[PDB]
Every structure is written in structure tokens, then in C-alpha cells.
Amino acid sequence: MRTHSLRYFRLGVSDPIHGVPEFISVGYVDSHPITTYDSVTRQAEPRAPWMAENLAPDHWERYTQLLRGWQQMFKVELKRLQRHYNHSGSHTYQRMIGCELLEDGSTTGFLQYAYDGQDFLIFNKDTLSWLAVDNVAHTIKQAWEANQHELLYQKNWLEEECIAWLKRFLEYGKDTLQRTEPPLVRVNRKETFPGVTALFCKAHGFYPPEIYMTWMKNGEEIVQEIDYGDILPSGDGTYQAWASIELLYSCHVEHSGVHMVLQV
């Protein structure tokens, strides 16, 4: 298997404008949404057909109840945070928990918090400690590090529980997640500003979104200014990207263990 990751985000919004939920929680396996919940629907729902088909109603009923309690917990932590900062109005609170299964079989786990879209607290599961960005974050950390059983629970969840969930979801969503759509790559040449030639290397129709694109000069790295286009979703499960240079030249593309060269 390629590298895969499972992530769960939480977004808490104080004093929300009409049409904005107070709480959102979405789960992801790689780029794919898998679960959703908001303070408006108050229901845990699948966001992938392979999640709906393989997880029995009891799973949705159970997570609906946990998310209702997590919603309450988040509303209260955000109030305590605002009080610590002497802040009023609309502020945001976010959490990201997750894990990665790498190709070589090793694993990673991360758990972090953000206040107003900025880094606030970062868990270090190897020293069982929290890294605080300021005095307010430091006050919270001091309380969270007093509960040694919670720290141990978090480590166990990140290392064992998250990996086991991810391995389950990778099997459920096998036909989506473990598939390969090779890229369609073309090099376009054009005389731009008088005496300047622009080389564009464009790729599309590829899955997974992880691609390596680089321009080379006579076999070795081009110590010039390369422009890179974002890996953008095409809307059909596949992606697109590009790389450009100015003026022997060859575009190099790596996708799912296949290397491609496009000589000019």
C-alpha cells in the first residue's frame, strides 16, 4: 500500500452569523470526506458511499451521541479561551486528530489545537506532553498534563486505535482509495514576451493527488526559477497540476511508481 492517513477535524464558532453552524466535525481518509456532523443537523452521517454500506446504523447512532457531547465540550472550552484572552464576539476553535500509515509500515499520529486559525496546543505523544504557544496555552497545558491517564489514553488512541480504524476504512473504500489513474501529461511551448519562450508541463486525470513534477536541464536539476501550479481537484475524483520554466529541457513526472520524461 501507498501512504494513507485518517483525520478528524472539529470547528467551533462563537456568536455565529446566520447560516453558520456553531460546531462542525468532519472525518477524512486522505483527500476523501468520510463522516460529517454539525450543530444544525445534530446527526453523524457518512460522506462516502463505502462508509454508508459498511458501517451499520448502530455506529451512526453511537457517534451522533458522542458528537453531541463533543459539541458541548467545544462550546465550553471556547468560552474559557475567550475569557483567558479577554476576547468578545466571534472567535474560532479547531482541533485536528489523526494518523498516517506509511509505505514501509511505520506510523505517525498527531493531535493539535488552533485558536482563531492559529497554532495553540500540540500534543507530543512521545514525551506525553503538550506544547503551548503562549501563556494562555500554557495555563491550559498545565491542567491537561495533570491527568496522566488521559495522556496515556491519547497515546494509545493515536498509535493503536487510529491505525486500526484507518486499516478498516482502507479495506471498505479499497476500490476508490487503492486505485491508480495515471496522469495525462503534455509539454506546451510558446513565445511569450519578445525573445522569451515559456515551457509548460501540464498533468491531468490522475489519482492519487500525490505527483512529483520537475523540469531538468541536460539531465541535471534546472538551477532556474520554476513556477508550480497547485494540485487541483477536477471534480470527478481525479486531479490536475502543472510546472513552467523559460529558455536540452525535459519535464519529469513521478506518479504511483511510474517515472515519465517529456524531452523538448
Partner: antibody, heavy 109, light 114 residues
């Protein structure tokens, strides 16, 4: 989670040692708990274990082997007051508690 | 810090009953268990936080009300002899948390007779 097993009854002598075992077969693991329940009273928390090792709270010790799917509650220097039931509970993947039928411990003076 | 009432109660089949439970510990999660000889505690209903409740392992014959953060009452609509048991109420700070222990009430000994 599906099943938790612990012996129905255990008898040991006062001043000695007793080990109450708990085996679990669950779908996910987020921790094992031990409760002490005196006859006619409410259960009271004794210990929590989620990672491998042995934790000691006086004469009481709790051990967890996440690989063997087992735990034990160890009682040292047995006193007559330790005559009680010992309940074993495991939190599954979905954070739901799975309870064992309990172990009644009888101390011989 | 959990207070449950009544400690004892005799009921006639078809009679209604409400069991009371309060905690002054600022806990969000509340549970109603029944203890029957030869088996582990069986969850009737639980309340993960204020504003929500759900069925447990054995909800038939019961209903619950999470009145506020402090109180969670258990109701027996039409008492039945199989409902003769020892009932326990419990609270924990949160659910969806691994380490957080249960705090039990003193228990309610209920007898149902024809």
C-alpha cells in the same frame, strides 16, 4: 466489544496475595477499569489501564497486557475488609463499557 | 457526589415509578444501570451530555429524562416482575474519553410483585 471473562469466585488466606484475572475479547480497546463493590454497596473506582505495564496504588496493583488481551488486579497483605466483589470493565472502539460478571473474593481469617 | 432515590421500593405489577438521580460534580455524562445476579452491569439508558439521551443494552420497559446537567431520572411505565433488580445511577465528566471513571449512586432496590 463482545466478551469479558473473570472468575465467579476466589478464596485466599488473610495476610497473603490474590491475583484476579480479566480476559477481554473486544472490537477496539480504549482502556480497562477495575471497580471494588462491597456487598450491598455501590461500585467504587480502583484503577485504569490502557497501555502495557503494572500500576500500584498501595496494596492494590493493576497490570495490562494489550497483546495477550488480559489484565489482573493484584491484592497484597490481604485483610478481611478486602472481602468484596471486583468488577472488570473495558471501553471498546466506540467508548462503550463492557462489564464482566464480577469476582466475589472471600478471605479466610 | 451522586445522590439517587429511593433506596428501596415495593411495586405492584402495572404501577409506574420514577427513580431520581442528581450529581453536583459538573459531570456531563449520566447513566442508568441495573445489576442482576450472575451477570455484569447492564446499561438501560445513558445521557452523553445535557440535551441528549440514548438507549443502552436493555431499554424495554423504561424511559429517561435528562432534566438538566445535574439530574437524570429513570421511569418504569408499567412495572413488571422482571424489573425487580438493583438499579444504579452513575456519572462521568465526559464520554468519548477513555480514562474517565464512573461515579455511582448508592443504588435502588426495587421489588415488583403481582
Amino acid at each position: 466489544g463482545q466478551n469479558i471473562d473473570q472468575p465467579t469466585e476466589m478464596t485466599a488466606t488473610e495476610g497473603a496475595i490474590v491475583q484476579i484475572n480479566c480476559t477481554y475479547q473486544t472490537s477496539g480497546f480504549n482502556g480497562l477499569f477495575w471497580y471494588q463493590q462491597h456487598a450491598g454497596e455501590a461500585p467504587t473506582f480502583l484503577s485504569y489501564n490502557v497501555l502495557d505495564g503494572l500500576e500500584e496504588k498501595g496494596r492494590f496493583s493493576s497490570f495490562l497486557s494489550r497483546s495477550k488481551g488480559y489484565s489482573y488486579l493484584l491484592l497484597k497483605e490481604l485483610q478481611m475488609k478486602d472481602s468484596a466483589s471486583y468488577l472488570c470493565a473495558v471501553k471498546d472502539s466506540n467508548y462503550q463499557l463492557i462489564w464482566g460478571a464480577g469476582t466475589k473474593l472471600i478471605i479466610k481469617p | 457526589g451522586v445522590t439517587q432515590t429511593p433506596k428501596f421500593q415495593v411495586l405492584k405489577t402495572g404501577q409506574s415509578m420514577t427513580l431520581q438521580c442528581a450529581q453536583d460534580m459538573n459531570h456531563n455524562s449520566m447513566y442508568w444501570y441495573r445489576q442482576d445476579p450472575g451477570m455484569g452491569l447492564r446499561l438501560i439508558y445513558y445521557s452523553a451530555s445535557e440535551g441528549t439521551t440514548d438507549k443502552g443494552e436493555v431499554p424495554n420497559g423504561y424511559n429517561v429524562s435528562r432534566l438538566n446537567k445535574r439530574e437524570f431520572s429513570l421511569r418504569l411505565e408499567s412495572a413488571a416482575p422482571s424489573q425487580t433488580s438493583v438499579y444504579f445511577c452513575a456519572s462521568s465528566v465526559w464520554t468519548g474519553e477513555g480514562s474517565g471513571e464512573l461515579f455511582f449512586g448508592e443504588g435502588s432496590r426495587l421489588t415488583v410483585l403481582e
